[PDB]
Design a binder for these strands. Structure first.
Lengths: 414, 428
RNA sequence: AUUGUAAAAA
RNA sequence: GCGGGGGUUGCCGAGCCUGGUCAAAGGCGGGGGACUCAAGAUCCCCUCCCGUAGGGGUUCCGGGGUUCGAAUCCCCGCCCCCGCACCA
């Protein structure tokens, strides 16, 4: 498993740093050769491509497109056959930081087999296909009922997304102790009646695609009496009624009561499993509510605390410019291992924060999450790579710094 | 020439406390509802097999409310004593309906805390799951300062005007009120009554000799503790919206006086709007002074998407707003860790908006008001601190130092209360 | 008794 | 199920009825080239594995038997296809 943490980190890197690989013209070929195809068929069809790009229009674009078909044509004869995973190749030339130019030539075999085909030349590379390599946990639907309105939305990971929502008016005057029940019934027995209807309408328009639920199931959230009328409806009957994961009694509606419907339905979704990560950021937090001391937070504490014992869970945040550096000492024949961020790192002479100003000479640098991925099993049990999109996620990154741990002993801290 | 004062009275109570039943008496006993009407309420309730709700059906209006014997939407009813005109506010006996309960709390000045003495019904009201907590955090949040504690259901099978249950009620409330909304021990008034038979509402009971104080209708009339009238450039929070005779808008006049035929402007909205008819409390006026619960017919460009929980304001001197702010928070039962990036839903007046804490300022003591000179990672249960806060959208606010009824806030998440908030600096 | 895509007109 | 006939090198198909003169004709396809800007007709070369000197190693479904020697002769196994029939 600890070996797939590293893979996902690599893929995140790869994915981002292939859009940041932009060039100009049609100098940026993406080629995806599927499982066990015909090397000669592809290599030929690229000599048919080089032949038509020997016209192409616009001087430097020709010459660059040619040199980038040439790179693949040469390396594709290295392969004996198309492996079971197919070959993903990305050849072109890119401008990078400082407005400098680099001829980019990538040719690899995906860890998990690619399930798509593509020969396409833009001015940037295509990265949409590599998302399919890590693939899905789901993807839930959420109906939020309230006496002022209703809201259709999804929860995928830790991200609440709002798809659609309408508001309703009801006459909150019926008399003054001498109550008129004709005022009661008249408009309401049609507002309420048309509203359970329209909830079921906007549930069938939004949560059904190609004869099937797009989301994995529905969680239904609402105030009293409006939901036991909607669940057991003939309007909600068939496919939606048989995908009802959990219900939830809530105190409010809208986006307010979209939050409260997840708070209450957390363990019944499950496995989301990013929701269950937010639970476990819950669990870290309510260690820190007590005197029992198996918690650490920040870099400093957390670090020396992993060095002198073991964490059950080591909890790190996905985006994270903090890194493990190893500096030799200015005096020679001694060394320092320090954690820096982009700002400190630019002062290459001290490689430290401006207030300290201490002198150093950097030899190697491993990203702090990458360093952790590669040793969590020698320093503890389990690692969690974590999101910010939930209210527990938000808090971890903002007020702990997206780094802390649930230890296996009583620690003490600064 | 002589004016009777216009203020509302509100009933906050246990879920089963008979908030409707006491309502039904108090109109009948002041003649506001006719004998014919009580006969018809008797009949309609009997014919559908609902005998013990005859009085309750005077306030419980909707089907589910009539069926169960306690409200879900907020109900308003008018009665008149010798010195005053009242609109009385039944606040939901169900707990999923907190938006009807905040609008009921908001129109108060005066809140009547109705506690049932019945075995089972009494004890259950003081648990976390009861409605007494949610009702006291709302009355304090709405400006309430004189609490009337009415011990209901006292002539019943299991209560014989028990002085012991009555003392149990008093004793339990002084710390429960003191803890949930920071109430002091005094400006509290206790009275036993029964709603079903109307005992101690207008006349003295002889089953009860030990209580020789005033009944509820003679008392309420003669209570001096009303602080509603506030002079100043004019402010109305919208508490309810609805169409009847034209489009109508309800709220409390929490600064100054607005005359019929004249402009308002709404806020943050800035929506020009003219009055068409003024019913102050529940009778026609053409002039209306501050502190009165207004029931105004409006004429605007919009009228059915008009949002409750924003203010109307002077057109003329419009009014402070956020959406960024610093504030003092006091952590009663999260009960776990809040650090920065914490979220909740935000109650001030009739507003119920999402909010998040941006950066966390400093720790503050309960005593002396003294802040720490360093800044923390986090805050925990039973502490107090200062935090910066962003709302999802934009709310209009006063500072607590300006007007506390537009400044005192409640950190709501679950069916619980995490902190009580006090807005200090309105940004930008 | 074949085949050849993308930025030119005071 | 009972039978019957088959499975050849990248593919297709000779040749196995003639045991040593089979590392396996031919076709198609692949690879390298000329062809005279570019394809690309046409033609030529190469095309089991391994190796520095036409050497070593392994093949005609899998595995044995018979022979000095079998891809070629005999048997069993797996797999495929086809009749007929109880049952599937």
């Amino acid at each position: 498993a600890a070996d797939r943490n590293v893979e996902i980190w690599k893929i995140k890197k790869l994915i981002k740093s292939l859009e940041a690989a932009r060039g100009n013209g049609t100098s940026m070929i993406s080629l995806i050769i599927p499982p066990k195809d015909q090397i000669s068929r592809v290599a030929k069809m690229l000599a048919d491509e080089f032949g038509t790009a020997s016209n192409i229009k616009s001087r430097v674009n020709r010459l660059s497109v040619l040199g980038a078909i040439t790179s693949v044509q040469q390396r594709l004869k290295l392969y004996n056959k198309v492996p079971p995973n197919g070959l993903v190749v990305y050849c072109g030339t890119i401008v990078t930081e400082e407005g400098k130019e680099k001829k980019v030539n990538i040719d690899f075999e995906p860890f998990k087999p690619i399930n798509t085909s593509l020969y396409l030349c833009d001015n940037k590379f295509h990265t949409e296909a590599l998302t399919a390599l890590l693939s899905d946990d789901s993807k839930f639907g959420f109906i939020v009922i309230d006496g002022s309105g209703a809201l259709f939305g999804t929860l995928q990971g830790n991200t609440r997304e709002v798809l659609h929502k309408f508001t309703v008016d009801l006459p909150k005057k019926h008399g003054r102790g001498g109550q008129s029940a004709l005022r009661f019934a008249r408009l309401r027995m049609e507002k309420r009646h048309n509203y359970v209807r329209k909830v079921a309408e906007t549930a069938v328009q939004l949560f059904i695609s190609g004869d099937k639920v797009n989301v994995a199931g529905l969680v239904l959230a609402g105030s009293a009496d409006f939901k036991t009328e909607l669940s057991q409806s003939d309007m909600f009957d068939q496919r939606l009624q048989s995908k009802v994961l959990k219900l939830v009694d809530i105190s409010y509606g809208g986006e307010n009561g979209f939050n409260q419907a997840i708070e209450l339905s957390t363990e019944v979704l499950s496995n989301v499993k990013f929701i269950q990560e937010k639970k476990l950021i819950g669990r870290y937090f309510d260690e820190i509510s007590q005197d029992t001391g198996k918690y650490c937070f920040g870099v400093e504490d957390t670090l020396k605390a992993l060095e002198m014992g073991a964490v059950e869970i080591l909890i790190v945040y996905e985006n994270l410019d903090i890194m493990r550096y190893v500096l030799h000492c200015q005096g020679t024949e001694e060394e320092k291992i320090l954690y820096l961020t982009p700002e400190q790192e630019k002062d290459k002479s001290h490689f430290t924060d401006k207030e300290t100003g201490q002198e150093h000479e950097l030899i190697e640098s491993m990203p702090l999450l990458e360093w952790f991925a590669n040793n969590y099993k020698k320093f503890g049990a389990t690692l969690e790579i974590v999101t910010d999109k939930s209210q527990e996620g938000s808090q971890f990154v903002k007020g702990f710094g997206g780094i802390g741990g649930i230890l296996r002993y009583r620690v003490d801290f600064q | 020439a002589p004016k009777k004062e216009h203020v509302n009275v509100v009933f906050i109570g246990h879920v089963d406390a008979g908030k409707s039943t006491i309502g039904g008496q108090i109109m009948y006993l002041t003649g506001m509802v006719d004998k014919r009407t009580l006969e018809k309420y008797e009949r309609e309730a009997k014919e559908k097999n609902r005998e013990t709700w005859y009085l309750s059906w005077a306030l419980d209006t909707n089907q589910e409310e009539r069926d169960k014997g306690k409200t879900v939407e907020v109900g308003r009813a008018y009665f008149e004593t010798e010195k005053k005109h009242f609109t009385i506010l039944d606040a939901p006996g169900h707990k999923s309906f907190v938006p009807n309960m905040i609008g009921g709390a908001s129109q108060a000045d005066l809140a009547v805390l109705v506690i049932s003495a019945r075995k089972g019904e009494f004890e259950t009201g003081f648990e976390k799951g009861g409605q007494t907590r949610e009702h006291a955090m709302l009355a304090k949040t709405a400006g309430v300062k004189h609490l009337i504690v009415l011990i209901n259901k006292m002539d019943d099978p299991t209560v014989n005007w028990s002085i012991e249950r009555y003392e149990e009620c008093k004793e339990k409330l002084v710390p429960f009120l003191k803890k949930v909304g920071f109430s002091p021990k005094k400006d509290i008034h206790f009275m036993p009554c029964s709603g079903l038979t109307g005992a101690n509402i207008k006349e003295q009971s002889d089953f009860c000799p030990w209580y020789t104080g005033l009944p509820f209708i003679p008392y309420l009339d003669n209570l001096p503790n009303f602080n509603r009238s506030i002079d100043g450039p004019i402010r109305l929070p919208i508490v309810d919206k609805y169409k009847d005779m034209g489009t109508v808008v309800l709220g409390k006049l929490e600064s100054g006086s607005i005359c019929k035929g004249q402009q308002l402007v709404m806020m943050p909205n800035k929506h020009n709007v003219e009055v068409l008819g003024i019913l102050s409390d529940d009778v026609e006026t053409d002039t209306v002074a501050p502190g009165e619960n207004l029931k105004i017919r409006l004429k605007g460009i919009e009228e059915e998407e008009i949002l409750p929980g924003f203010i109307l304001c002077d057109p003329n001197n419009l009014c402070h707003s956020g959406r960024t702010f610093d504030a003092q928070i006091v952590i009663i039962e999260h009960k776990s860790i809040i650090c920065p990036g914490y979220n909740a839903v935000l109650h001030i007046h009739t507003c119920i908006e999402e909010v998040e804490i941006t950066a966390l300022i400093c720790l503050v003591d309960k005593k002396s008001g003294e802040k720490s000179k360093t800044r923390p990672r986090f805050v925990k249960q039973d502490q107090v601190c200062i935090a910066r806060l962003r709302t999802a959208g934009t709310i209009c606010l006063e500072t607590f130092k300006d007007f506390p009824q537009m400044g005192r806030f409640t950190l709501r998440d679950e069916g619980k209360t995490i902190a009580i908030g006090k807005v200090l600096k309105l940004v930008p």
